[PDB]
Amino acid sequence: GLFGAIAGFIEGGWQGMVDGWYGYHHSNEQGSGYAADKESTQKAIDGVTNKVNSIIDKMNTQFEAVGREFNNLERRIENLNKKMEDGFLDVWTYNAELLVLMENERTLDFHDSNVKNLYDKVRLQLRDNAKELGNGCFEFYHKCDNECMESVRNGTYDYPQYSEEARLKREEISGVRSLV
Amino acid sequence: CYPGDFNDYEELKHLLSRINHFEKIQIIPKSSWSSHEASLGVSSACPY
């Protein structure tokens, strides 16, 4: 939908990422593997949990109807009573539906940016050092092991440590050597 | 046309809100009035 990610360029979610809502998958000399981003799932849960309790709180003053008894020749205020309570019970039933319909749209879109903002986070760290492969995934120039994955995972990668390594690879898969 | 009032008028009209068809039946024949005079209950207030 709105933000571009879920059901977007990242075609399909993974069943293998069991521990959390968004996360990482890597592939290197040592292993392959999935790893949920807890930090940012835990932040998304905070926000959904708050949404759920938001509603609950908002409908404790909602219209309570205790009944009234009515006569044979009071028929037309008996009705007035019935028109009212049926009235309010329609107005609050509408409200409770529409709010859900509205919050559900907002919630599914909340995940949609959650994912994308993660990706763009990874992207802004790894710059020239990696290829944007265009399907949710990056391949590095410099070859990056497990300890170095973590840094990307926990957002403290170091560009100017693998620079040469990487830009020796850029330098060459640019066919620039091929003139000597 | 002969003036007065209709006791509990609105309560009736409201009851008429739920009815889709009447059928007028005869409960007391005008002819069958015994030892009174049913014929001469007319008034110029209600001209026909």
Q: Where are the domains of chain A?
A: 1-180
* CATH level 3 topology of A1-180: Hemagglutinin Ectodomain; Chain B (3.90.20)
Angstrom resolution of this structure? 3.2
Experimental technique of record: X-ray
Bridge partners (DSSP) of residue A139 are A131
With CB atoms and an 8 Å threshold, state whether B11 touches A79.
no
Q: How far apart are CA A152 and CA A144, in angstroms?
A: 10
- Give the residue from A133, A118, A153 showing the smallest Cα distance to A22: A118
Using alpha carbons only, give the angle A50, A106, A60 rounded to the nearest 5 degrees.
Answer: 45
DSSP state of B8: T
With CB atoms and an 8 Å threshold, state whether B15 touches A75.
yes
* Chain B residue closest in CA terms to A72: B11
> What is the pairing mode between strands A130-132 and A32-36?
unpaired
**Contact at 8 Å (CB) between A23 and A121?**
no
With CB atoms and an 8 Å threshold, state whether B14 touches A79.
yes
**Contact at 8 Å (CB) between A119 and A5?**
yes
